[PDB]
Design a protein around this ligand. Sequence first.
Ligand code: GNP
Ligand code: MG
Lengths: 178, 133, 132
Amino acid sequence: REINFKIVYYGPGLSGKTTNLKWIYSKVPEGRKGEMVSLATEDERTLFFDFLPLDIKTRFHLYTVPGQVFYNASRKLILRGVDGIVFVADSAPNRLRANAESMRNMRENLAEYGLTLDDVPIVIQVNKRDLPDALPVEMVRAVVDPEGKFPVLEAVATEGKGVFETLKEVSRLVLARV
Amino acid sequence: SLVLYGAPYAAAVEVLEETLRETGARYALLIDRKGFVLAHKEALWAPKPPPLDTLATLVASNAAATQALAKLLGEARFQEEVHQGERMGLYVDEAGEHALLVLVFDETAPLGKVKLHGKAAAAALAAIAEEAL
Amino acid sequence: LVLYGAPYAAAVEVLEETLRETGARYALLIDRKGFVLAHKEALWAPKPPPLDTLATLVASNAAATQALAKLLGEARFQEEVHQGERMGLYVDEAGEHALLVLVFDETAPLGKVKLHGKAAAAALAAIAEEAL
Ligand SMILES: Nc1nc2c(ncn2[C@@H]2O[C@H](COP(=O)(O)OP(=O)(O)NP(=O)(O)O)[C@@H](O)[C@H]2O)c(=O)[nH]1
Ligand SMILES: [Mg+2]
């Protein structure tokens, strides 16, 4: 009947993690989706997580994690059992370091589960390519994936650009392991 | 993961229907700690339930967060949880290390029987879950 | 919601008293984003586990359980008491914008915990309101 998979969206505050789910939700037909759930603060910064369940019998559970540094304890929990990860990096000059800290943070959290960055498929999304001062892609990429060992996709998640292909690619990788 | 197919699944469903009979509860679920609905049953008499997937992520994450707090207080675990409104309530308990028993109930169901059979049901499902890991 | 000056001294005074009346180790007043607004430790008790972590977890948890309530047509569930072999935790709303947490061990009698717990929450609620 049905295999279940968990996908997590990771990355620094404001990089667009929640926006990816909002897009995806707005374009998947009713019949291939359940309702989206968000536990967010008053300023729509995610506090616990987002959750969106979907069809592609293979069921994908997508989650977002809160990116702000001081929400680490909830971030940890949301990675439990993860099967595939989308790391959404920010394109803004002033957020490059935020990117790297979040990546170092993701290795630290996985290591508490006994997992390395080799153990879970990971897809890098460089989001926010519309910004006037957008850093070159390979610079942002060099910071997060110094060895180029992870697929890269460019995105403007506020407009849909890259949202689904990023999703397809992490999907592709998770199935290729099963 | 946790492959719940075949004879385990049928046993699991049997424990859930029996639990609804004995307790007067509206909805019974077996979920995993990741959030995945593994088996569920509704009291025939009961209205349509709220979206079961929403309910299951919320309960997984509530179990995960309270278990994180037990851990940071030096404790292996807290006790089973009952959440109680003016009319509606939830009973959540451990179905072994990988799963949760959820029961949703209302003002018609005697809380005492919820806990007593809630507990019995949890232990029965632990037993089925261990045979299917 | 930031407590400072006199409102802050007021909140501190409720926490010390609550700690004395119950035998609990630590009492916190946290906002619903998980920021610690104030706190006190009993002089006799160990160095606490990390309270910023504790607060975040407590606030996340409150988000989930408010969301379960709403999903069942309920305004809220009631106050929560979590209990282990020896350690426990009392959580209660102190108004719309904040929570009161008490952390206690086996020497804190549960009845006292709940009674004073409830009163502190009410007290803290009023300080938080009259601070706007
Ligand atoms: N220009 C531009 N803005 C974007 C893009 N993606 C998201 N934004 C904006 O960035 C802000 C943050 O988006 P959000 O998804 O809430 O970020 P998040 O990663 O979920 N943040 P957090 O971890 O705090 O929940 C919003 O204003 C959103 O519209 C983008 O690709 N380009
Ligand atoms: Mg978010």
